[PDB]
Amino acid sequence: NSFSGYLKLTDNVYIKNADIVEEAKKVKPTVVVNAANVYLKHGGGVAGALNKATNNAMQVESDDYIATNGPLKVGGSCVLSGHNLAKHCLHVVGPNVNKGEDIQLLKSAYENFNQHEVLLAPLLSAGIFGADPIHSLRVCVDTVRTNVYLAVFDKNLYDKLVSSFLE
Ligand SMILES: CC(C)[C@H](Nc1ncnc2[nH]c(C(=O)N[C@H]3CCN(C)C3)cc12)c1ccc2c(c1)S(=O)(=O)CCC2
């Protein structure tokens, strides 16, 4: 958990303009959060980047979890191996508002972070999941009580998020 170069927003929420994959390799955190879908199909975006960094071992392990346990629910999670990225991967399903899922489930999604003392995470439901990223940060700050280090791989969005929080 050797996080560096983060800006502390609240006593438990830190933020950096960084690629979560590169952060995971440098930091070696106890937990890395994946922005998953309910069938754990890591086809693109953040989930595809983390799977590629494990040389597809994450996808094979995820298919075996799904065969035995069935899909997750939107707002839910599961803990699987972190492989070379972390001790554990917390797969969390935030709502995909571009597909009509309820934005209120973003609170349930962040609530899953509270079962882990320290986590490296992306901004849930942002990007192609369609949520307003400034609203996602507000829900994170209001809901997560354990220590969360957010990696946001876009300087333009990082600057808008920091400006919005410090208003
Ligand atoms: C909003 C954007 C900036 C954000 N994207 C990111 N944030 C953090 N770390 C990121 N890594 C990457 C990435 O592609 N790394 C590669 C690039 C080469 N490298 C060796 C690995 C993107 C990343 C973001 C956050 C959440 C969500 C999305 C996108 S999504 O569209 O995948 C839908 C799910 C939710």
Short mmCIF file of all heavy atoms in Angstrom, two decimals, residues 91-163:
data_model
loop_
_atom_site.label_atom_id
_atom_site.label_comp_id
_atom_site.label_asym_id
_atom_site.label_seq_id
_atom_site.Cartn_x
_atom_site.Cartn_y
_atom_site.Cartn_z
N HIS A 91 -14.46 -7.28 -7.31
CA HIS A 91 -15.21 -6.95 -8.51
C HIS A 91 -16.51 -6.26 -8.11
O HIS A 91 -17.34 -6.92 -7.45
CB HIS A 91 -15.48 -8.22 -9.36
CG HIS A 91 -14.21 -8.88 -9.87
ND1 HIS A 91 -13.66 -8.56 -11.14
CD2 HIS A 91 -13.40 -9.80 -9.29
CE1 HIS A 91 -12.59 -9.32 -11.27
NE2 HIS A 91 -12.38 -10.07 -10.18
N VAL A 92 -16.72 -4.99 -8.47
CA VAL A 92 -17.92 -4.25 -8.06
C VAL A 92 -18.71 -3.84 -9.28
O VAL A 92 -18.12 -3.30 -10.23
CB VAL A 92 -17.53 -2.99 -7.26
CG1 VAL A 92 -18.77 -2.11 -6.97
CG2 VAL A 92 -16.79 -3.37 -5.99
N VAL A 93 -20.04 -4.09 -9.27
CA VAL A 93 -20.91 -3.73 -10.36
C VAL A 93 -21.67 -2.40 -10.09
O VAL A 93 -22.59 -2.38 -9.29
CB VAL A 93 -21.90 -4.85 -10.70
CG1 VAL A 93 -22.68 -4.48 -11.97
CG2 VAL A 93 -21.15 -6.17 -10.90
N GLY A 94 -21.20 -1.30 -10.68
CA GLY A 94 -21.97 -0.06 -10.60
C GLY A 94 -23.03 -0.04 -11.69
O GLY A 94 -22.95 -0.79 -12.66
N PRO A 95 -24.07 0.82 -11.55
CA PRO A 95 -25.12 0.83 -12.58
C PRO A 95 -24.57 1.38 -13.90
O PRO A 95 -23.75 2.29 -13.88
CB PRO A 95 -26.18 1.81 -12.01
CG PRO A 95 -25.43 2.62 -10.95
CD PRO A 95 -24.38 1.69 -10.41
N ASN A 96 -25.11 0.90 -15.01
CA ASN A 96 -24.78 1.39 -16.34
C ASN A 96 -26.01 2.16 -16.74
O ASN A 96 -27.05 1.58 -17.17
CB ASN A 96 -24.52 0.20 -17.31
CG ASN A 96 -24.08 0.70 -18.67
OD1 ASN A 96 -24.45 1.79 -19.10
ND2 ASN A 96 -23.21 -0.06 -19.37
N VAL A 97 -25.96 3.48 -16.52
CA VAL A 97 -27.12 4.32 -16.82
C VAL A 97 -27.38 4.43 -18.33
O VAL A 97 -28.52 4.68 -18.74
CB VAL A 97 -27.10 5.70 -16.13
CG1 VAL A 97 -26.66 5.61 -14.66
CG2 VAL A 97 -26.25 6.67 -16.89
N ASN A 98 -26.34 4.19 -19.18
CA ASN A 98 -26.55 4.19 -20.63
C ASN A 98 -27.42 2.99 -21.04
O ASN A 98 -28.00 2.99 -22.13
CB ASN A 98 -25.21 4.20 -21.36
CG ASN A 98 -24.56 5.56 -21.38
OD1 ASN A 98 -25.25 6.59 -21.35
ND2 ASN A 98 -23.23 5.60 -21.41
N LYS A 99 -27.54 1.96 -20.17
CA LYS A 99 -28.41 0.81 -20.40
C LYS A 99 -29.65 0.79 -19.50
O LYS A 99 -30.26 -0.26 -19.32
CB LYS A 99 -27.62 -0.48 -20.26
CG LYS A 99 -26.56 -0.57 -21.31
CD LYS A 99 -25.85 -1.88 -21.23
CE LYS A 99 -25.44 -2.33 -22.60
NZ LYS A 99 -26.62 -2.70 -23.43
N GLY A 100 -30.03 1.95 -18.97
CA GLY A 100 -31.24 2.10 -18.17
C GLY A 100 -31.21 1.65 -16.72
O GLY A 100 -32.28 1.63 -16.10
N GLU A 101 -30.05 1.24 -16.17
CA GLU A 101 -29.96 0.80 -14.76
C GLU A 101 -30.01 2.04 -13.81
O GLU A 101 -29.65 3.14 -14.21
CB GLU A 101 -28.68 -0.04 -14.53
CG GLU A 101 -28.68 -1.24 -15.46
CD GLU A 101 -27.40 -2.04 -15.51
OE1 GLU A 101 -26.40 -1.62 -14.88
OE2 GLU A 101 -27.42 -3.11 -16.17
N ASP A 102 -30.53 1.84 -12.59
CA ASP A 102 -30.83 2.92 -11.65
C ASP A 102 -29.60 3.54 -11.02
O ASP A 102 -28.81 2.85 -10.37
CB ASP A 102 -31.73 2.32 -10.56
CG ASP A 102 -32.29 3.31 -9.57
OD1 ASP A 102 -32.00 4.53 -9.71
OD2 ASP A 102 -33.00 2.87 -8.64
N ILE A 103 -29.46 4.86 -11.16
CA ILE A 103 -28.31 5.57 -10.58
C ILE A 103 -28.25 5.41 -9.06
O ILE A 103 -27.18 5.56 -8.46
CB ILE A 103 -28.30 7.06 -11.05
CG1 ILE A 103 -26.98 7.80 -10.73
CG2 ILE A 103 -29.52 7.80 -10.46
CD1 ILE A 103 -25.74 7.18 -11.28
N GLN A 104 -29.40 5.14 -8.40
CA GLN A 104 -29.42 4.98 -6.93
C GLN A 104 -28.57 3.79 -6.47
O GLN A 104 -28.02 3.81 -5.36
CB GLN A 104 -30.87 4.91 -6.42
CG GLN A 104 -31.57 6.24 -6.74
CD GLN A 104 -33.00 6.37 -6.25
OE1 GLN A 104 -33.99 5.99 -6.94
NE2 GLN A 104 -33.15 7.00 -5.10
N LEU A 105 -28.37 2.79 -7.35
CA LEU A 105 -27.52 1.64 -7.07
C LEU A 105 -26.04 1.98 -6.94
O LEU A 105 -25.25 1.14 -6.51
CB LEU A 105 -27.72 0.50 -8.13
CG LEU A 105 -29.11 -0.13 -8.05
CD1 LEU A 105 -29.43 -1.00 -9.28
CD2 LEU A 105 -29.29 -0.92 -6.76
N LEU A 106 -25.62 3.20 -7.33
CA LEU A 106 -24.25 3.63 -7.17
C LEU A 106 -23.89 3.70 -5.67
O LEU A 106 -22.76 3.35 -5.31
CB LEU A 106 -24.04 4.97 -7.89
CG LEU A 106 -22.62 5.48 -8.00
CD1 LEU A 106 -21.69 4.43 -8.68
CD2 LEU A 106 -22.56 6.73 -8.82
N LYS A 107 -24.85 4.02 -4.79
CA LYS A 107 -24.58 3.99 -3.33
C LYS A 107 -24.30 2.55 -2.87
O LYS A 107 -23.29 2.29 -2.20
CB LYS A 107 -25.80 4.57 -2.57
CG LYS A 107 -25.72 4.43 -1.05
CD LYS A 107 -26.83 5.28 -0.42
CE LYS A 107 -27.12 4.85 1.01
NZ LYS A 107 -28.26 5.59 1.64
N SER A 108 -25.13 1.58 -3.32
CA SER A 108 -24.93 0.18 -2.96
C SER A 108 -23.55 -0.29 -3.49
O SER A 108 -22.84 -0.98 -2.78
CB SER A 108 -26.02 -0.69 -3.60
OG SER A 108 -27.30 -0.37 -3.06
N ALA A 109 -23.19 0.14 -4.71
CA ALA A 109 -21.91 -0.28 -5.28
C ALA A 109 -20.74 0.20 -4.38
O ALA A 109 -19.87 -0.60 -4.07
CB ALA A 109 -21.76 0.29 -6.69
N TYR A 110 -20.72 1.48 -4.00
CA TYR A 110 -19.65 2.00 -3.15
C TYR A 110 -19.69 1.38 -1.75
O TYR A 110 -18.63 1.24 -1.13
CB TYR A 110 -19.71 3.54 -3.07
CG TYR A 110 -19.03 4.22 -4.24
CD1 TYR A 110 -19.75 5.01 -5.12
CD2 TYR A 110 -17.65 4.13 -4.42
CE1 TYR A 110 -19.12 5.67 -6.19
CE2 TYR A 110 -17.02 4.75 -5.51
CZ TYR A 110 -17.76 5.53 -6.37
OH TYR A 110 -17.15 6.21 -7.42
N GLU A 111 -20.88 1.01 -1.26
CA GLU A 111 -20.95 0.41 0.07
C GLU A 111 -20.08 -0.88 0.18
O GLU A 111 -19.60 -1.23 1.27
CB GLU A 111 -22.41 0.12 0.45
CG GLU A 111 -23.13 1.33 1.02
CD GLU A 111 -24.62 1.13 1.25
OE1 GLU A 111 -25.16 0.08 0.83
OE2 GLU A 111 -25.26 2.07 1.75
N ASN A 112 -19.90 -1.58 -0.97
CA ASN A 112 -19.04 -2.78 -0.94
C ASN A 112 -17.60 -2.48 -0.51
O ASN A 112 -16.92 -3.37 0.02
CB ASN A 112 -19.02 -3.45 -2.30
CG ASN A 112 -20.32 -4.01 -2.72
OD1 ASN A 112 -20.75 -5.06 -2.19
ND2 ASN A 112 -20.96 -3.39 -3.68
N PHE A 113 -17.10 -1.24 -0.77
CA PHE A 113 -15.73 -0.89 -0.40
C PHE A 113 -15.52 -0.94 1.11
O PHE A 113 -14.40 -1.14 1.57
CB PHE A 113 -15.39 0.55 -0.85
CG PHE A 113 -15.20 0.81 -2.33
CD1 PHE A 113 -15.85 0.04 -3.29
CD2 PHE A 113 -14.51 1.92 -2.75
CE1 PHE A 113 -15.73 0.34 -4.66
CE2 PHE A 113 -14.43 2.25 -4.11
CZ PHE A 113 -15.02 1.45 -5.05
N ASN A 114 -16.61 -0.75 1.90
CA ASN A 114 -16.49 -0.68 3.35
C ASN A 114 -16.09 -1.99 4.03
O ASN A 114 -15.75 -1.96 5.22
CB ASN A 114 -17.80 -0.13 3.92
CG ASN A 114 -17.89 1.36 3.60
OD1 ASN A 114 -16.86 2.05 3.57
ND2 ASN A 114 -19.10 1.93 3.44
N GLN A 115 -16.07 -3.13 3.29
CA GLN A 115 -15.62 -4.39 3.88
C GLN A 115 -14.10 -4.55 3.83
O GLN A 115 -13.60 -5.61 4.24
CB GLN A 115 -16.27 -5.60 3.16
CG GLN A 115 -17.73 -5.45 2.79
CD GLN A 115 -18.63 -5.13 3.96
OE1 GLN A 115 -18.24 -5.27 5.14
NE2 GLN A 115 -19.85 -4.72 3.64
N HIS A 116 -13.35 -3.54 3.28
CA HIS A 116 -11.90 -3.61 3.12
C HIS A 116 -11.28 -2.33 3.67
O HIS A 116 -11.76 -1.25 3.35
CB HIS A 116 -11.61 -3.78 1.61
CG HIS A 116 -12.26 -5.04 1.09
ND1 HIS A 116 -11.67 -6.28 1.29
CD2 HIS A 116 -13.47 -5.23 0.52
CE1 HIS A 116 -12.51 -7.17 0.78
NE2 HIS A 116 -13.62 -6.60 0.34
N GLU A 117 -10.22 -2.44 4.49
CA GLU A 117 -9.58 -1.30 5.15
C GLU A 117 -8.94 -0.31 4.17
O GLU A 117 -9.02 0.92 4.37
CB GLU A 117 -8.50 -1.76 6.16
CG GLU A 117 -9.08 -2.28 7.47
CD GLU A 117 -9.80 -1.18 8.22
OE1 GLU A 117 -9.21 -0.09 8.43
OE2 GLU A 117 -10.97 -1.42 8.60
N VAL A 118 -8.28 -0.83 3.11
CA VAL A 118 -7.58 0.05 2.14
C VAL A 118 -7.86 -0.48 0.74
O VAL A 118 -7.66 -1.68 0.51
CB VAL A 118 -6.05 0.08 2.38
CG1 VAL A 118 -5.33 0.94 1.33
CG2 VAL A 118 -5.68 0.54 3.79
N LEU A 119 -8.17 0.40 -0.24
CA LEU A 119 -8.45 -0.09 -1.59
C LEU A 119 -7.91 0.89 -2.60
O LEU A 119 -7.92 2.11 -2.37
CB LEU A 119 -9.97 -0.14 -1.86
CG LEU A 119 -10.88 -0.79 -0.85
CD1 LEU A 119 -11.41 0.28 0.08
CD2 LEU A 119 -12.12 -1.46 -1.58
N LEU A 120 -7.51 0.37 -3.77
CA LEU A 120 -7.16 1.12 -4.96
C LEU A 120 -8.35 0.96 -5.87
O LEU A 120 -8.74 -0.17 -6.12
CB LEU A 120 -5.89 0.57 -5.65
CG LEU A 120 -5.63 1.07 -7.08
CD1 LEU A 120 -5.31 2.61 -7.12
CD2 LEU A 120 -4.42 0.36 -7.64
N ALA A 121 -9.00 2.08 -6.33
CA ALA A 121 -10.23 1.93 -7.11
C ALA A 121 -10.34 2.90 -8.27
O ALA A 121 -9.78 3.99 -8.21
CB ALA A 121 -11.42 2.21 -6.17
N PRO A 122 -11.20 2.56 -9.25
CA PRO A 122 -11.55 3.53 -10.28
C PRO A 122 -12.84 4.27 -9.85
O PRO A 122 -13.50 3.91 -8.84
CB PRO A 122 -11.84 2.63 -11.49
CG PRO A 122 -12.64 1.43 -10.78
CD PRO A 122 -11.96 1.29 -9.41
N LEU A 123 -13.21 5.32 -10.60
CA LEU A 123 -14.44 6.05 -10.32
C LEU A 123 -15.64 5.28 -10.88
O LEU A 123 -15.88 5.24 -12.10
CB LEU A 123 -14.33 7.43 -10.95
CG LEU A 123 -15.38 8.48 -10.55
CD1 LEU A 123 -15.22 8.87 -9.08
CD2 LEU A 123 -15.18 9.73 -11.44
N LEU A 124 -16.43 4.67 -9.96
CA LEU A 124 -17.52 3.83 -10.44
C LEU A 124 -18.52 4.48 -11.35
O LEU A 124 -18.95 5.63 -11.14
CB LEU A 124 -18.26 3.16 -9.26
CG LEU A 124 -17.39 2.29 -8.35
CD1 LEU A 124 -18.23 1.70 -7.16
CD2 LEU A 124 -16.76 1.13 -9.10
N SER A 125 -18.98 3.70 -12.35
CA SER A 125 -20.04 4.06 -13.30
C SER A 125 -19.69 5.26 -14.23
O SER A 125 -20.55 5.70 -14.97
CB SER A 125 -21.38 4.27 -12.59
OG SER A 125 -21.88 3.04 -12.07
N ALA A 126 -18.45 5.76 -14.20
CA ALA A 126 -17.98 6.83 -15.10
C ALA A 126 -17.67 6.23 -16.51
O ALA A 126 -17.98 5.04 -16.79
CB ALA A 126 -16.76 7.52 -14.46
N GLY A 127 -17.14 7.06 -17.43
CA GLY A 127 -16.85 6.59 -18.78
C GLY A 127 -18.10 6.12 -19.48
O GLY A 127 -19.19 6.68 -19.27
N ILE A 128 -17.99 5.00 -20.16
CA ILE A 128 -19.10 4.48 -20.95
C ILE A 128 -20.25 3.89 -20.11
O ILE A 128 -21.31 3.59 -20.69
CB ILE A 128 -18.60 3.49 -22.03
CG1 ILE A 128 -17.86 2.33 -21.41
CG2 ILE A 128 -17.73 4.25 -23.04
CD1 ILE A 128 -18.70 1.23 -21.03
N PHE A 129 -20.13 3.84 -18.76
CA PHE A 129 -21.30 3.47 -17.96
C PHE A 129 -22.27 4.67 -17.81
O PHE A 129 -23.39 4.48 -17.34
CB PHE A 129 -20.97 2.86 -16.59
CG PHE A 129 -20.67 1.38 -16.52
CD1 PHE A 129 -20.08 0.72 -17.58
CD2 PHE A 129 -21.03 0.64 -15.39
CE1 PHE A 129 -19.74 -0.63 -17.47
CE2 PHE A 129 -20.70 -0.72 -15.30
CZ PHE A 129 -20.03 -1.33 -16.32
N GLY A 130 -21.87 5.86 -18.23
CA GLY A 130 -22.79 6.98 -18.35
C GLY A 130 -23.11 7.84 -17.15
O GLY A 130 -23.84 8.83 -17.33
N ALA A 131 -22.65 7.47 -15.92
CA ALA A 131 -22.95 8.33 -14.76
C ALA A 131 -22.19 9.64 -14.83
O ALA A 131 -21.15 9.73 -15.49
CB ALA A 131 -22.55 7.63 -13.46
N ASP A 132 -22.72 10.70 -14.16
CA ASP A 132 -22.00 11.97 -14.12
C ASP A 132 -20.83 11.75 -13.17
O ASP A 132 -21.03 11.40 -12.02
CB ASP A 132 -22.97 13.02 -13.54
CG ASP A 132 -22.44 14.45 -13.48
OD1 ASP A 132 -21.22 14.63 -13.27
OD2 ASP A 132 -23.25 15.40 -13.59
N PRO A 133 -19.58 11.92 -13.65
CA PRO A 133 -18.42 11.62 -12.79
C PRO A 133 -18.34 12.47 -11.52
O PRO A 133 -17.89 11.99 -10.47
CB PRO A 133 -17.21 11.85 -13.71
CG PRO A 133 -17.74 12.78 -14.81
CD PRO A 133 -19.17 12.34 -15.01
N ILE A 134 -18.86 13.74 -11.59
CA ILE A 134 -18.81 14.59 -10.39
C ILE A 134 -19.77 14.00 -9.34
O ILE A 134 -19.41 13.92 -8.16
CB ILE A 134 -19.23 16.04 -10.75
CG1 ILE A 134 -18.11 16.74 -11.53
CG2 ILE A 134 -19.56 16.87 -9.49
CD1 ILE A 134 -18.62 18.10 -12.17
N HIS A 135 -20.93 13.49 -9.78
CA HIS A 135 -21.90 12.85 -8.87
C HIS A 135 -21.25 11.57 -8.33
O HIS A 135 -21.41 11.28 -7.12
CB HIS A 135 -23.22 12.47 -9.64
CG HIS A 135 -24.18 11.69 -8.79
ND1 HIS A 135 -24.69 12.22 -7.61
CD2 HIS A 135 -24.64 10.42 -8.95
CE1 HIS A 135 -25.44 11.25 -7.08
NE2 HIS A 135 -25.46 10.16 -7.86
N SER A 136 -20.57 10.77 -9.18
CA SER A 136 -19.93 9.55 -8.65
C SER A 136 -18.93 9.83 -7.50
O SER A 136 -18.92 9.13 -6.48
CB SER A 136 -19.28 8.75 -9.77
OG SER A 136 -18.75 7.53 -9.26
N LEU A 137 -18.18 10.93 -7.63
CA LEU A 137 -17.22 11.28 -6.58
C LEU A 137 -17.93 11.67 -5.32
O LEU A 137 -17.53 11.26 -4.24
CB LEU A 137 -16.30 12.41 -7.08
CG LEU A 137 -15.26 12.90 -6.00
CD1 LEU A 137 -14.34 11.73 -5.55
CD2 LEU A 137 -14.40 14.02 -6.59
N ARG A 138 -19.05 12.40 -5.44
CA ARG A 138 -19.82 12.80 -4.28
C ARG A 138 -20.38 11.59 -3.57
O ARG A 138 -20.32 11.53 -2.33
CB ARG A 138 -20.94 13.77 -4.67
CG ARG A 138 -20.39 15.11 -5.20
CD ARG A 138 -21.39 16.24 -4.97
NE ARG A 138 -20.98 17.47 -5.66
CZ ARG A 138 -21.57 17.95 -6.74
NH1 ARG A 138 -22.58 17.28 -7.31
NH2 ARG A 138 -21.13 19.07 -7.31
N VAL A 139 -20.89 10.60 -4.34
CA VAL A 139 -21.43 9.39 -3.67
C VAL A 139 -20.28 8.63 -2.95
O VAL A 139 -20.46 8.11 -1.82
CB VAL A 139 -22.17 8.45 -4.66
CG1 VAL A 139 -22.65 7.17 -3.94
CG2 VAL A 139 -23.36 9.18 -5.29
N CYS A 140 -19.08 8.59 -3.57
CA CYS A 140 -17.91 7.90 -2.95
C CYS A 140 -17.57 8.54 -1.59
O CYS A 140 -17.44 7.88 -0.54
CB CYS A 140 -16.71 8.06 -3.86
SG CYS A 140 -15.23 7.14 -3.30
N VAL A 141 -17.45 9.87 -1.62
CA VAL A 141 -17.07 10.62 -0.43
C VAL A 141 -18.12 10.42 0.69
O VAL A 141 -17.74 10.31 1.86
CB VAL A 141 -16.90 12.12 -0.78
CG1 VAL A 141 -16.91 13.01 0.46
CG2 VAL A 141 -15.60 12.33 -1.57
N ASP A 142 -19.43 10.38 0.32
CA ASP A 142 -20.52 10.28 1.29
C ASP A 142 -20.76 8.89 1.79
O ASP A 142 -21.38 8.71 2.85
CB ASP A 142 -21.83 10.79 0.69
CG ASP A 142 -21.91 12.28 0.45
OD1 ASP A 142 -21.09 13.05 1.08
OD2 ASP A 142 -22.78 12.70 -0.33
N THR A 143 -20.23 7.85 1.06
CA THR A 143 -20.56 6.49 1.38
C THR A 143 -19.41 5.64 1.91
O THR A 143 -19.62 4.82 2.82
CB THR A 143 -21.10 5.78 0.07
OG1 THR A 143 -22.16 6.59 -0.44
CG2 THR A 143 -21.57 4.32 0.33
N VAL A 144 -18.21 5.83 1.37
CA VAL A 144 -17.08 5.01 1.77
C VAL A 144 -16.50 5.56 3.06
O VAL A 144 -16.30 6.78 3.20
CB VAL A 144 -16.02 5.04 0.65
CG1 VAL A 144 -14.80 4.21 1.03
CG2 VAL A 144 -16.61 4.54 -0.67
N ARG A 145 -16.31 4.67 4.03
CA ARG A 145 -15.74 5.03 5.30
C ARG A 145 -14.35 4.48 5.52
O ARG A 145 -13.63 4.97 6.40
CB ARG A 145 -16.71 4.62 6.43
CG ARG A 145 -17.98 5.50 6.43
CD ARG A 145 -18.91 5.19 7.59
NE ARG A 145 -20.26 5.74 7.38
CZ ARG A 145 -21.29 5.54 8.20
NH1 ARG A 145 -21.14 4.81 9.30
NH2 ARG A 145 -22.47 6.07 7.93
N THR A 146 -13.95 3.47 4.77
CA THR A 146 -12.58 2.95 4.82
C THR A 146 -11.69 3.81 3.87
O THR A 146 -12.18 4.77 3.28
CB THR A 146 -12.58 1.48 4.46
OG1 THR A 146 -13.23 1.35 3.21
CG2 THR A 146 -13.31 0.63 5.55
N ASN A 147 -10.41 3.48 3.73
CA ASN A 147 -9.45 4.33 3.03
C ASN A 147 -9.42 3.96 1.56
O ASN A 147 -8.88 2.90 1.24
CB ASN A 147 -8.10 4.17 3.70
CG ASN A 147 -8.21 4.42 5.21
OD1 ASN A 147 -8.53 5.53 5.63
ND2 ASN A 147 -8.02 3.39 6.05
N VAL A 148 -9.83 4.88 0.69
CA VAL A 148 -9.90 4.62 -0.74
C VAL A 148 -9.05 5.58 -1.54
O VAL A 148 -9.05 6.80 -1.30
CB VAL A 148 -11.37 4.56 -1.25
CG1 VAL A 148 -12.12 5.86 -1.00
CG2 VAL A 148 -11.42 4.23 -2.75
N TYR A 149 -8.22 4.98 -2.41
CA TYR A 149 -7.31 5.74 -3.30
C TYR A 149 -7.89 5.58 -4.69
O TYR A 149 -7.87 4.50 -5.29
CB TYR A 149 -5.92 5.16 -3.21
CG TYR A 149 -5.28 5.40 -1.86
CD1 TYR A 149 -5.70 4.70 -0.73
CD2 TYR A 149 -4.37 6.42 -1.67
CE1 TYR A 149 -5.17 4.96 0.53
CE2 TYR A 149 -3.81 6.68 -0.42
CZ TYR A 149 -4.21 5.93 0.67
OH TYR A 149 -3.70 6.17 1.93
N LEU A 150 -8.41 6.71 -5.22
CA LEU A 150 -9.04 6.72 -6.55
C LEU A 150 -8.02 7.11 -7.61
O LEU A 150 -7.39 8.16 -7.51
CB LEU A 150 -10.21 7.76 -6.61
CG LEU A 150 -11.42 7.49 -5.70
CD1 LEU A 150 -12.33 8.72 -5.67
CD2 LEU A 150 -12.25 6.30 -6.26
N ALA A 151 -7.90 6.27 -8.61
CA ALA A 151 -7.05 6.54 -9.79
C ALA A 151 -7.95 6.88 -10.97
O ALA A 151 -8.81 6.09 -11.38
CB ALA A 151 -6.15 5.31 -10.09
N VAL A 152 -7.77 8.11 -11.54
CA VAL A 152 -8.63 8.57 -12.64
C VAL A 152 -7.71 8.87 -13.80
O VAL A 152 -6.91 9.79 -13.70
CB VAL A 152 -9.43 9.83 -12.21
CG1 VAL A 152 -10.27 10.33 -13.39
CG2 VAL A 152 -10.34 9.50 -11.00
N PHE A 153 -7.74 8.02 -14.84
CA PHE A 153 -6.79 8.13 -15.95
C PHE A 153 -7.18 9.18 -17.01
O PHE A 153 -7.35 8.85 -18.19
CB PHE A 153 -6.56 6.73 -16.58
CG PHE A 153 -5.35 6.60 -17.49
CD1 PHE A 153 -4.22 7.39 -17.30
CD2 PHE A 153 -5.29 5.61 -18.45
CE1 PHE A 153 -3.14 7.30 -18.16
CE2 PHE A 153 -4.18 5.50 -19.29
CZ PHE A 153 -3.10 6.30 -19.09
N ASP A 154 -7.24 10.46 -16.59
CA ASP A 154 -7.58 11.55 -17.52
C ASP A 154 -7.36 12.84 -16.75
O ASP A 154 -8.10 13.11 -15.80
CB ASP A 154 -9.05 11.43 -17.92
CG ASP A 154 -9.50 12.47 -18.92
OD1 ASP A 154 -8.86 13.53 -18.98
OD2 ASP A 154 -10.44 12.19 -19.68
N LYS A 155 -6.34 13.62 -17.14
CA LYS A 155 -5.99 14.85 -16.43
C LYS A 155 -7.16 15.85 -16.46
O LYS A 155 -7.36 16.61 -15.52
CB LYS A 155 -4.74 15.50 -17.08
CG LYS A 155 -4.32 16.84 -16.44
CD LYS A 155 -3.95 16.70 -14.97
CE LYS A 155 -3.29 17.96 -14.39
NZ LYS A 155 -3.47 18.00 -12.89
N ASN A 156 -7.88 15.91 -17.61
CA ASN A 156 -8.98 16.89 -17.76
C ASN A 156 -10.07 16.58 -16.76
O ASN A 156 -10.59 17.50 -16.13
CB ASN A 156 -9.55 16.86 -19.20
CG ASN A 156 -8.47 17.05 -20.24
OD1 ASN A 156 -8.08 16.09 -20.96
ND2 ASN A 156 -7.89 18.23 -20.25
N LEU A 157 -10.44 15.31 -16.67
CA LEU A 157 -11.47 14.91 -15.71
C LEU A 157 -10.95 15.04 -14.26
O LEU A 157 -11.67 15.59 -13.42
CB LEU A 157 -11.89 13.47 -15.97
CG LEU A 157 -12.93 12.93 -14.98
CD1 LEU A 157 -14.20 13.83 -14.93
CD2 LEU A 157 -13.38 11.52 -15.39
N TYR A 158 -9.70 14.62 -13.98
CA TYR A 158 -9.10 14.81 -12.65
C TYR A 158 -9.23 16.28 -12.18
O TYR A 158 -9.64 16.54 -11.05
CB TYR A 158 -7.63 14.37 -12.68
CG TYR A 158 -6.85 14.70 -11.44
CD1 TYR A 158 -6.93 13.89 -10.32
CD2 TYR A 158 -6.12 15.88 -11.34
CE1 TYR A 158 -6.26 14.22 -9.15
CE2 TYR A 158 -5.46 16.23 -10.16
CZ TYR A 158 -5.52 15.38 -9.07
OH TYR A 158 -4.91 15.68 -7.86
N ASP A 159 -8.86 17.23 -13.08
CA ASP A 159 -8.90 18.64 -12.69
C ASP A 159 -10.34 19.10 -12.44
O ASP A 159 -10.58 19.85 -11.50
CB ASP A 159 -8.24 19.49 -13.80
CG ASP A 159 -6.71 19.48 -13.81
OD1 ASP A 159 -6.12 18.96 -12.86
OD2 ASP A 159 -6.11 20.02 -14.78
N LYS A 160 -11.31 18.59 -13.24
CA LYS A 160 -12.71 19.02 -13.01
C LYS A 160 -13.23 18.45 -11.69
O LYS A 160 -13.99 19.12 -11.00
CB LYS A 160 -13.66 18.57 -14.15
CG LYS A 160 -13.52 19.42 -15.43
CD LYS A 160 -14.18 18.75 -16.64
CE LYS A 160 -13.84 19.50 -17.93
NZ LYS A 160 -15.05 19.77 -18.76
N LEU A 161 -12.82 17.23 -11.36
CA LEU A 161 -13.28 16.59 -10.12
C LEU A 161 -12.70 17.32 -8.91
O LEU A 161 -13.41 17.55 -7.94
CB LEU A 161 -12.82 15.13 -10.08
CG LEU A 161 -13.57 14.21 -11.04
CD1 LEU A 161 -12.89 12.81 -11.04
CD2 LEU A 161 -15.04 14.10 -10.67
N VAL A 162 -11.39 17.67 -8.95
CA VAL A 162 -10.77 18.35 -7.80
C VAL A 162 -11.42 19.75 -7.65
O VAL A 162 -11.80 20.14 -6.53
CB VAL A 162 -9.23 18.40 -7.90
CG1 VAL A 162 -8.60 19.23 -6.78
CG2 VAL A 162 -8.66 16.99 -7.84
N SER A 163 -11.58 20.46 -8.77
CA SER A 163 -12.22 21.78 -8.72
C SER A 163 -13.64 21.75 -8.13
O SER A 163 -14.00 22.64 -7.35
CB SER A 163 -12.22 22.45 -10.09
OG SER A 163 -12.94 23.67 -10.00
#
